[PDB]
Copies of this chain bind each other. A is one copy, B any other.
Amino acid sequence: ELFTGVVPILVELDGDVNGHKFSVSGEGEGDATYGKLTLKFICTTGKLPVPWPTLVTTLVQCFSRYPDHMKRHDFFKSAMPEGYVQERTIFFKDDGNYKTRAEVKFEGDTLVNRIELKGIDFKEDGNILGHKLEYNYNSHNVYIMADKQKNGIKVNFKTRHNIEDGSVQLADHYQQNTPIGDGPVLLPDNHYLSTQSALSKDPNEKRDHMVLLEFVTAAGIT
């Protein structure tokens, strides 16, 4: 009953990639009913030291549309509003990696995602730091399974980002979410979320920003 309409979303990330610090602030609204997200972020420290496409998976999966028969597999929402803690280790192939740790919960009537990120081992002339990534996004599948020992889930997936020269910089995602609360939560059978995104820019916007459009649906349980 919390995600029955349009929920306001607020995001906040502090990061450090190879010693460079940045902050991103973002606002938007989600609608679990359609599993649609609209978010706008702004680098609040001037210019972003890494390409926007690498921060998309870091920058609120509770927003997924779960079909009615797949309702009892929604760990995401069954953990609200105390929230859950999402933890990730993202490995960009032949490059460095992001270690992230976020806390997603309701702070009043707004759903908030507070992130802390540390990148390390990035090649100064690779696609990330080199900014050879196209400003766009592809569809991927987010694999999920229960982690009972933790009363949470384990999620893994791989994203593919296009390079200017026609190639693909693959990023490996190891994920984990544990509830913030102490009560029973919903532990899912194996399944995944079909995820699709499109990035664009507000033309009136002066700050270095990114407009993110997203749709997410669960699948895999028959």
Binding site for B on A (CB under 8 A): 33-36, 65, 134-139, 162, 194, 196-200, 202-203, 213-215, 217
Contact = CB atoms under 8 A, between A and B. Distances in A.
* Interface of A (DSSP majority class): strand
B35 A200 contact: yes
A215 B194 contact: no
Contacts of A196: 136-137, 198-200
Given A136-B139, A138-B138, 12 more contacts: A33-B203, A35-B200, A136-B194, A136-B196, A137-B139, A139-B162, A139-B198, A196-B199, A197-B198, A198-B198, A198-B213, A213-B213
Contacts of A162: 139
Nearest to A198: B196
Contacts of A213: 198, 213, 215
Contacts of A198: 139, 196-198, 213-215
A217 B199 CA distance: 11
Contacts of A136: 139, 194, 196
Given A203-B33, A203-B34, A194 B135 contact: yes
Contact of A203 (B65, B135, B202, B215): B65
A18 B34 CA distance: 34
A155 B139 CA distance: 24
Contacts of A137: 139, 196
Contact of A217 (B33, B194, B200, B217): B200
A215 B197 contact: no
A213 B216 CA distance: 13
A135 B138 CA distance: 13
A116 to B, nearest CB: 29
Q: What are the 5 tightest A-B residue pairs by CB atom distance, in nearest-first order?
A: A136-B139, A196-B198, A138-B138, A200-B215, A198-B215
Nearest to A136: B139
Contact of A200 (B34, B138, B200, B203): B34
Nearest to A68: B203
